């Protein structure tokens, strides 16, 4: 019934949890607050596969 | 008209009536001069600030202003005679316990 | 770790008595009787019997707390008629009437063939 998918380090069963993150190679625009001079800033997290 | 205030004149009057079994048929021995002197004496005995000087007396009258108005409104002579039928002993007991409950309701010094 | 002893639900402890009568100043000819190591099984029975007994003015029962197997029964009766005698009469009535129930059950089983 145990479906596996975990490591055993020093006999302790260890599971790696999926780390959610912003997708790579995408252009996203965000509106910025009035006090900052920046407005409508675009960001891209460029990444090689 | 509804505001927080220390002691319920209405409730103490009901307690007086129940305790003394006030007979509504029989006339009341109270006299208007006795009523007015009783209310004035109670108002004088209503002390929350105690200190013999003009500033403290003004402060005490200031503190007990609203409650003085409520006492006059409730134990007015017309209300005491017509709406209420308290006897002399009942009125005296009411005044004594109004004074007592005010003097309990005073802040207990040392409150944080 | 500290649950109550099961045997203490019905066995008397050291320095303890089954019955403790105390008269009450509350009303005349009135006693409160504490039964130790008992449940409502006797309580309802005895209370109902006192109610059926026509001379008894008040009969009621009480568990202070479900934890302790103990319950109190207050009886007040008429002047001159002891609540102890009332309880004796009620218990004797229960003895006789349970005996009649037993006899009827024994005689009426044997009519069955299974």
């Amino acid at each position: 019934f145990d479906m596996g998918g975990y490591f055993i380090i020093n006999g302790s069963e260890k599971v790696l949890i999926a780390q959610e993150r912003s997708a790579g190679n995408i252009v996203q625009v965000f509106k910025k607050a009035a006090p900052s001079p920046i407005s409508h800033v675009a960001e891209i997290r460029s990444a090689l596969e | 008209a509804n505001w927080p205030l220390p002691v319920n004149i209405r409730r103490i009057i009901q307690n007086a009536q129940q305790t003394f079994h006030i007979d509504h048929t029989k006339p009341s021995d109270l006299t208007i001069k006795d009523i007015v002197l009783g209310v004035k004496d109670l108002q004088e005995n209503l002390l929350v600030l105690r200190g013999k000087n003009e500033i403290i007396q003004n402060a005490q009258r200031d503190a007990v202003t609203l409650f003085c108005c409520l006492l006059r409104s409730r134990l007015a002579t017309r209300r005491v005679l017509q709406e209420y039928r308290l006897t002399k002993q009942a009125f005296d007991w009411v005044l004594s316990n109004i004074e007592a409950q005010f003097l309990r309701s005073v802040v207990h010094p040392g409150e944080m | 770790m500290n649950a109550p002893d099961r045997f203490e639900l019905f066995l008397l402890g050291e320095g303890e008595s089954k019955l403790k009568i105390d008269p009450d100043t509350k009303a005349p000819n009135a006693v409160v009787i504490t039964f130790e190591k008992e449940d409502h099984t006797l309580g309802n029975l005895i209370r109902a019997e006192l109610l059926n007994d026509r001379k008894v003015l008040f009969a009621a029962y009480k568990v202070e707390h479900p934890f302790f197997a103990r319950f109190k029964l207050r009886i007040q009766t008429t002047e001159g008629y002891d609540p102890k005698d009332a309880l004796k009469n009620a218990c004797n009535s229960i003895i006789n009437k349970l005996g009649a129930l037993k006899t009827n059950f024994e005689t009426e089983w044997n009519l069955q063939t299974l």
Binding site: - | - | F7, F10, S17, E49, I95, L98, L101, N104
Partner: protein, 262 residues
């Protein structure tokens, strides 16, 4: 005469009857002492010689305690606490030995029949494991591989269900009264019609239906107690009722004895 009993039907494990001319307090108190305070025999202590099986021996001992045991002559048995002995005796305890070694490759089921008495009963029909299945095997106890061993001893002593439900002689005890609500002792919840939305109990056929025209019979009292006792098997359903009445009588007599001594 006192209360009247009428048994509608009888069985080895079920007895259904009607109690008439009896108080509701008595109907309860009889039911209560019957379901709680009848003395009965059951496995109290378990000594495990060896256990290689996959079940915790705590779990095994709990099971052996819950197993029914014959309690026909429980009256002739005496309480362990009042008895005096050295760890064991026939006058307050019954010793039962259970041995189970796997032989076959398939799983070897272990049953109540595997409990063999080793103490001297002295002629008291007590301690025989109860068997009711048509195969006669009895209650399943454990299961074993070929290589597994389970050897143990059991000391069963008199007790009542107040200590532990394993001493409980009676199973679900039925108590019903006034099936029709002539006394209006309950207010039936409904949405359109209580009579239509409530099942008609099987015992309403033994009472005349109410008449809407007539008024409420305020003099009426609770009577015609439809009871149905069922026994697990440790004691026949006859002596369930009879010894429930007997121990209620003994309890009231003990109250009288305490009263007299005080």
């Amino acid at each position: 005469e006192g209360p009247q009993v009428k048994i509608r039907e009888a069985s080895k494990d079920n007895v259904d009857f009607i109690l008439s001319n009896v108080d509701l307090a008595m109907a309860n108190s009889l039911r209560r002492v019957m379901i709680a305070e009848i003395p009965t025999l059951a496995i109290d202590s378990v000594e495990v010689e060896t256990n290689t099986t996959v079940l915790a021996d705590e779990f095994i001992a709990h099971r052996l305690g819950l197993i029914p045991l014959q309690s026909m002559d429980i009256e002739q048995l005496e309480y362990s606490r009042d008895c005096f002995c050295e760890d064991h005796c026939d006058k307050c305890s019954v010793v039962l030995t259970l041995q189970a070694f796997g032989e076959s490759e398939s799983t070897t089921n272990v049953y109540s029949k595997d409990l063999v008495i080793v103490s001297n009963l002295m002629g008291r029909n007590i301690g025989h494991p109860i068997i009711q299945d048509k195969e006669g095997n009895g209650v399943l106890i454990c299961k074993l591989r070929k290589g597994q061993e389970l050897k143990l001893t059991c000391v069963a002593k008199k007790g009542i269900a107040k200590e532990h439900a394993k001493w409980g002689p009676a199973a679900a005890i039925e108590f019903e009264y006034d099936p029709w609500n002539k006394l209006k002792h309950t207010d039936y919840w409904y949405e359109q019609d209580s009579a239509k939305e409530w099942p008609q109990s099987k015992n309403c056929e033994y009472e005349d239906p109410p008449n809407e025209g007539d008024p409420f019979d305020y003099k009426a009292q609770a009577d015609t107690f439809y009871m149905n006792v069922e026994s697990v098997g440790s004691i026949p359903v006859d002596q369930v009722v009879v010894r429930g009445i007997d121990t209620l009588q003994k309890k009231v007599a003990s109250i009288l004895l305490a009263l007299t001594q005080m």
